[PDB]
């Protein structure tokens, strides 16, 4: 219909989660909060895994001293990012 | 003698291959906004319907769209809410092209809803802005 039309378009897109992490699964507080332990009695940051699950650093530290697996996917835990 | 209809038909039926002299009678048209009451509302609805149209190239429609958006708050709020809703629905088929326009329109509509002490509508309007799922 036009003078220089378009026939084909090979698009490339990246998909990502709308909300990656919003609360530590252990302490149930927000991932930017004081991990419920530092909240009651005091630096609190995030500690990701190889599954990219992003629990609280202190919460995952307390969890790892008893269980060797990730709380969510129940797989062997390996540290990544901080 | 109803020459506005003839002018409108000629303008949309026009090819507009030059585009260099459009500025003069678009600036002339810009100051021609005040058409009293319902006539103004119908004229603005027709204008936004004609500019939303697919055939219009996306090089001048955006600029006059933002200019019309900034001219919009001068209108009374009672009709401003209606025309904001109407242009939101008219731009809904093509949102990815007009993202600045929908963002500004929703911000203004949420503001005028908040000034009416209507928190639910203002919050829902502000929600519609794509801040993560947006190009």
């Amino acid at each position: 219909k036009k003078r220089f039309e378009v026939k084909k378009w090979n698009a490339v897109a990246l998909w990502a989660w709308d909300i990656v992490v919003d609360n530590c699964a252990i302490c149930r507080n927000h991932i930017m909060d004081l991990c419920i332990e530092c909240q009651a009695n005091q630096e609190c940051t995030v500690a990701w895994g190889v599954c990219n699950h992003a629990f609280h650093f202190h919460c995952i530290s307390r969890w790892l001293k008893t269980r060797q697996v990730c709380p969510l996917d129940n797989r062997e835990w390996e540290f990544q990012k901080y | 003698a109803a020459a506005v209809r003839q002018d409108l038909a000629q303008l949309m039926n026009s090819s507009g291959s030059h585009k260099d002299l459009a500025g003069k009678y678009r600036q002339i048209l810009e100051k021609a906004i005040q058409l009293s009451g319902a006539e103004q509302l119908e004229a603005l609805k027709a204008f936004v319907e004609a500019m939303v149209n697919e055939n219009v190239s996306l090089v001048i429609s955006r600029q006059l769209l933002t200019d019309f958006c900034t001219h919009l708050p001068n209108l009374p709020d009672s009709t401003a809410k209606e025309i904001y809703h109407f242009t939101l629905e008219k731009i809904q088929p093509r949102v990815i092209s007009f993202e600045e326009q929908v963002a500004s329109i929703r911000q203004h509509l949420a503001s005028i809803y908040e000034k009416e002490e209507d928190w639910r509508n203002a919050a829902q309007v502000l929600v519609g802005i794509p801040l993560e799922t947006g190009q």
């Binding site: 378009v6 084909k8 090979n10 490339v12 897109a13 990246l14 998909w15 | 799922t133």
Partner: protein, 158 residues
């Protein structure tokens, strides 16, 4: 239920943001071409209806496509990136355009636009009559349809 005519043969590569090294690191404000906006809207609707809770970030610097010339002597079909396609689509108004028109239409950054212009000059798709292609205000590009292609694919990829 309603007939959907995209007007474009659409093929997409949807990739994980975390796994792939590609990212939207550049701040390019590339305005989408109007012909293929229906494709992106339909695919966004399909992705929303299919995968819940995800979002799409289209890598406009990695998607290519074919533009067909058929009434200018049938010079086969060219294959160019979307950056190199927005300028060609803006060239539909007339044979010669200015830098201001391309800036207002493609809405690309200065660096990306200059890269696209240089790549087009390598193709000799568009040209400048004189040596005034440097940083100025005129930038009067023009078509060079007389230098027709020799092959058909003309598959530039580097």
């Amino acid at each position: 239920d309603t007939v959907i005519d995209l007007g474009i043969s659409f093929q997409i590569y949807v990739l994980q943001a975390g796994a792939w090294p590609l990212t939207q690191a550049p701040s390019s404000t590339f305005a989408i071409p109007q012909e293929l906006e229906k494709s992106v809207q339909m695919f966004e609707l399909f992705y929303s209806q299919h995968f819940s809770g995800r979002k799409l970030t289209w890598l406009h610097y990695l998607c290519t496509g074919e533009v067909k010339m058929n009434y200018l002597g049938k010079p086969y079909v060219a294959m160019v990136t979307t950056y190199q396609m927005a300028v060609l689509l803006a060239f539909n108004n007339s044979e010669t355009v200015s830098y201001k028109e391309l800036q207002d239409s493609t809405q690309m950054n200065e660096k990306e636009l200059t890269k696209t212009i240089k790549s087009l000059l390598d193709v000799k798709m568009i040209n400048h009559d004189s040596e005034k292609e440097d940083i100025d205000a005129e930038s009067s590009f023009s078509l060079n349809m007389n230098f027709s292609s020799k092959r058909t694919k003309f598959k530039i990829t580097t």
